[PDB]
């Protein structure tokens, strides 16, 4: 079977999970764990060479840090989690170039274990048809879109400073990932927002400023 | 530099090359010969007809490139690409040989992609709304947009049941009379036309 896929939104932090799910307390045993995170970027794809792997993070087992600064400072580890057996990678800005395979090797006192993921990075946008700048009483269709190919499981719409929930109503028709405003009014000018949730739990938050003249 | 000719991928296009005021005998101008060269974006000849008025008969041969012999008799030596393909973009050079006259033509062909974007893009239920976008990949924006409905291509104007804005057509409430083909024509400032058809399916 293939690698589990983790999705990221470009510009937003992402968390690549690698965790002992049954840590039997013992913060003093799991203090002493260390991990190597390696990244296999996409070659793009006969008698081919094997894909290359380079180390993006290394923290030493034993319960100490050596004073070595991070090699790739946008890639990070939460050091509070190591006591709980959490060796997950944080990509502070998830970048397009960060896509590819991630391989963790964790060395504890008695054993070593591995974690393997494929990270894909997508782009979010509110697509406005005909446009975002509108005239009074025009119609507009907003699509809460993300470049992931599959269909999200839920879409939540919000409007205004305080994120007031937006439901199917006479002034707002909701269908799939789309919100149709049949007749914009002065109260429709301002910020709108959406949250897309996919079946793997990945969710995207998108904001957009509608202008009505 | 060169005149630009636009093409829609999947639709025929003709690269114009016509004698200015070509009113000679239709059997005199058929006896002309022409060479069309394409340097893709390495000049190579894509079709050559020899002067003298006789043919090799290989018109089914390479039918993606063609000359219309009615235009050849009318002094029109234009190249026809029956499916305009992505590979056809690039530089074109025509040379036409008559007994006492010569002509050369130089054009740049760019090919764009057309699509009817439907939101939502599936099959629709009666009384749903739907938005159609007549889109073309050309960078400049078209100067006019025309919408048509049905096999008989009846024009569609701004109304309560069909709202037109820019390149978009909104149908607020589909009915069984909306089932079937819809079409749009984009017209650009040079006269280039893009025709897109779309089959709406509604239960
Ligand atoms: C609208 O957004 C959804 C979610 O990303 C996407 O699957 C769909 O293709 C988009 N459609 C248009 C017309 O933008
Ligand atoms: C997305 O899912 C995560 C995981 O449960 C959750 O913490 C987050 O709150 C969800 N999205 C939003 C917009 O809150
Ligand atoms: C709709 O089509 C026009 C014409 O090419 C294009 O400029 C515009 O970006 C398209 N918008 C959407 C949402 O498809
Ligand atoms: C291009 O399309 C427009 C609108 O349908 C039409 O008026 C015009 O005559 C067309 N041009 C040609 C050369 O057919």
Swiss-Prot record, chain B:
Where does the UniProt entry place glycosylation sites?
133, 193
Chain residue ranges for the region called Interaction with FGL1 = 10-195
The record's subcellular location field reads:
Secreted
Ig-like C2-type domain residues: 114-195
According to the UniProt record, what happens if one changes residue 43 to E?
A: Decreased binding to MHC class II
Sequence ranges assigned to domain Ig-like V-type in this UniProt record: 10-112
Q: Which cysteines are joined by disulfide bonds?
A: 17-105, 134-184
Q: What is the effect of changing residue 70 to A?
A: No significant effect on MHC class II-binding
What is this protein for, i.e. what is its function? May function as a ligand for MHC class II (MHC-II) on antigen-presenting cells (APC), promoting APC activation/maturation and driving Th1 immune response.
Its name, as the record gives it, is Secreted lymphocyte activation gene 3 protein
Q: Which organism is it from?
A: Mus musculus
Question: Quick one: which gene encodes this?
Answer: Lag3
